[PDB]
Design a binder for this molecule. Structure first.
Ligand SMILES: CCCCCCCCCCCCCCCCCC(=O)SCCNC(=O)CCNC(=O)[C@H](O)C(C)(C)COP(=O)(O)OP(=O)(O)OC[C@H]1O[C@@H](n2cnc3c(N)ncnc32)[C@H](O)[C@@H]1OP(=O)(O)O
Ligand SMILES: CCCCCCCCCCCCCCCCCC(=O)O
Length: 90
């Protein structure tokens, strides 16, 4: 979608810190969908014990299996509405 690339833009230009503080879940959702969308199914090696953040990211992404690139695109957008909705209610 053009929408996906727009969503991605919004998120990329956000401030690193701010009034909303995203959950780890929220972060891993956006991260995994984004990888599924841009790189496809996770086929890289999984990071080791000394890289915990790498392991979480990988598990999230791998969890998506063989989800199509369109599938992940529209789920990214759905997650954006989800979080946007949380921010609106603050
Ligand atoms: C949610 C909607 C927004 C608001 C809705 C609007 C309506 C509401 C109205 C209210 C108005 C009030 C305004 C208040 C808003 C601010 C409040 C909050 O504090 S807001 C601010 C709170 N702070 C925020 O949440 C900040 C969120 N944004 C950021 O944190 C950064 O852009 C970043 C994390 C994506 C890093 O960028 P970068 O320079 O690349 O640094 P790294 O390379 O280290 O990134 C590492 C990995 O991430 C991967 N990846 C890349 N792009 C995306 C993507 N779009 N997605 C997912 N993943 C993406 C990338 O491929 C890489 O993979 P790998 O190679 O490691 O495997
Ligand atoms: C409105 C908020 C937008 C958020 C965009 C997040 C972008 C994705 C990249 C960040 C990687 C997530 C790593 C989190 C590790 C979790 C640690 C743990 O669960 O204790």
């Amino acid at each position: 979608q053009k929408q996906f690339q727009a969503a991605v833009s919004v998120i990329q230009n956000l401030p690193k810190n701010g009034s909303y503080r995203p959950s780890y879940e929220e972060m891993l959702r956006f991260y995994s969908y984004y990888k599924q969308a841009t790189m496809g199914p996770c086929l890289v090696p999984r990071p080791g014990f000394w890289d915990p953040i790498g392991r979480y990211k990988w598990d999230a992404w791998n969890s998506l299996g063989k989800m199509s690139r369109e599938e992940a695109m529209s789920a990214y957008i759905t997650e954006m509405k989800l979080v946007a909705q949380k921010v609106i209610d603050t």
